[PDB]
Amino acid sequence: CVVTPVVSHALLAQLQNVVHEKKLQCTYIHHDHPASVGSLVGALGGKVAVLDYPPPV
């Protein structure tokens, strides 16, 4: 069977708040032309936060 993933609006928007409030390890991903990708990406100025948990090597 072929699978196509898609990003959840509700889930990503919550993560942007939790990492800054709970002080989690994170970084930022840039998007050119934020208005062409979506409501949230535009509101965030083209910078979106993600979790960063590398292995202890």
Added chain:
RNA sequence: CCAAGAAAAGGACUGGAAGAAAUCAUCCAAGUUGGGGACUAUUUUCUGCCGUAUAGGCAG
């Protein structure tokens, strides 16, 4: 049969100028290292002639 499949970040460049770290000084006093002792054994090197000769040369 992998958030699957493909991919050239490149080209150029003058950090410079100038300067005083200085004056002073008490480490001292005492002191028990000692007592005992096998380098030779199953070793290998003897016996002679010439030569003034413990020199130098020789047979067995």
